[PDB]
Amino acid sequence: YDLNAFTFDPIKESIVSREMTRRYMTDMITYAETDVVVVGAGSAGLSAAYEISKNPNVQVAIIEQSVSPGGGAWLGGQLFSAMIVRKPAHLFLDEIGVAYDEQDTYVVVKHAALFTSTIMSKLLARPNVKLFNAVAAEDLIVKGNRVGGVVTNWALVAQNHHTQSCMDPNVMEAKIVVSSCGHDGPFGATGVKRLKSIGMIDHVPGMKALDMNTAEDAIVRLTREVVPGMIVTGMEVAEIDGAPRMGPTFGAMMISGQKAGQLALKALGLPNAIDGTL
C-alpha cells in the first residue's frame, strides 16, 4: 500500500457490530463453565495465567475490572519507570523474553511496561486464554463450602449500583478460582474480603508495613489454595495473612503467580511443579 494515496476496502457498519457480537457471545458461552478463572490481570494474575496456559488443554478466563490490564505493573515507584526484580526471578524474565540490566542480587527491567506488555502479548496469543476486561468479579459462587466460580458484571455497573435501578450480575462457573486482586483501590482484595464477609475465613488483618526481605519470601510461601476451589496470589496474600508489603519490587508477584498457576494445575489433577510431576 501507499501511505500517500491510501484506500481501505469497503465495509458495512452492521458487519462490524455482528462480528464483535458473535465472537464475544461464543466466548461467553464457552467460558460460562471454565477450568480456571483468574481474577485480576496485574503482575501476579498475568504470571499465573501465563504459567497455567502453558498447558494447552486448560481453559483460562481472566476477569479484569479495568479496561486496561496490567494492574500496578505499568510503573515502578513514585511514577518512575524501572522495575526491580530480585534474583532468582530473573530466570522467569528469561523465559518470557524480557531483557534486563543485571546487578548482583537483582536485575532491572528498564520499564515495568516492557514486562507487562511482553508477558501479555505471549499470554493472549494462546488459544486457551480469554481476557474479559472491563468486567468485575463482584462476588463468589459458593456451594457447600467450596468456591465454584465468580459472580460477574460490567465493571462500571459494579461501581454504579447506587445511581441506577438494580442491575443483576452474571455468573461464571470454574473448577478453580485464582484470586489476584491486589490490595490497591476500591476493588483491592475483593476475593479475600468476600471470604471474610461470608464466614469462610475468619480474619483479614491487612498488609503490614514495608520490609522487602521478609515480604517477598513470605508472599511466595503463603500463596496457596486458601479454601477449597480458591487460590490467592500476589498482594492479596498479604491482606489475608497480614504479611509485610514490599513496595516497588516485582519478583514476589511473578513467583507467587507462577506458584499459583502450578497449584491450579495440581487442583485440576494435572502434572505440576508442586508434586514434582511436571
- Within 10 angstroms of residue 81's Cβ, the number of other Cβ atoms is 14
| Torsion angle in degrees (nearest 10) through CA of 247, 253, 254, 257 | 180
Binding-site size for Zn ion (CB under 5 A) equals: 1
Q: Which residue number, 13 or 104, has a Cβ lying nearer to Zn ion?
A: 13
Q: Which of 101, 102, 184, 275 binds Zn ion (CB under 5 A)?
A: 184
Rounded CA-CA distance 48/71 in Å is: 14
Shorter beta-carbon distance to a second copy: residue 7 or 57? 7
CB of 225 to a second copy, least distance (A): 14
Spell 110-144 as b/e; 16+ CB within 10 A means b: eebebbbbbbbebbbeeebbbbbeebbbbbbbbee
Q: Binding site for substrate: which residues?
A: 44, 64-65, 72, 137, 168, 183, 235, 245-247
Which grid coordinates belong to 189? 482484595
Residue 128 contacts which entry, a second copy, Zn ion, none (Cβ below 5-8 A, type-dependent): none
**Residue number with CB closer to Zn ion (94 or 184):** 184
Distance of closest approach, residue 264 Cβ to Zn ion, in angstroms: 24
8 A C-beta contact, residue 170 and residue 204: no
Cβ at position 65, least distance to a second copy in Å: 10
Residues between 221 and 240 with contacts to Zn ion, criterion CB under 5 A: none
Residues placed in the known binding site: 44, 64-65, 72, 137, 168, 183, 235, 245-247
What is the footprint of Zn ion within residues 95-114 (CB under 5 A)?
none
Closest CB to a second copy among residues 31, 58: 31
Amino acid at 261: G
Separation of alpha carbons 264 and 156, rounded Å: 29
Q: Cβ closer to Zn ion: 184 or 275?
A: 184
- Per partner kind, with CB cut-offs from 5 to 8 A, the member of Zn ion, a second copy, none near residue 57 is none
Which are the contacts of 161, defined by CB distance < 8 A and separation ≥ 6? 167
Least Å distance, CB 210 to a second copy, is 5
Handedness of CA 113, 115, 116, 117 (dihedral sign): positive
Nearer to Zn ion, 85 or 264 (CB): 85
275 binds Zn ion (CB under 5 A): no
Query: Which residues lie across from 152 on neighbouring strands?
Result: 137, 170
Rounded Cα gap, residues 9 and 223, in angstroms: 51
**Shortest distance in whole angstroms from residue 57 CB to a second copy:** 19
- Cα 86 from Cα 104, distance rounded (Å): 9
The strand pairing partners of 227, in sequence order, are 230
CB of 184 to Zn ion, least distance (A): 4
Residue nearest to Zn ion (CB): 184
Binding site partner of 45, from a second copy, Zn ion, none, Cβ cut-off 5-8 A by kind: none
Kindly list the residues in this chain that would bind Zn ion in the complex (CB under 5 A). 184
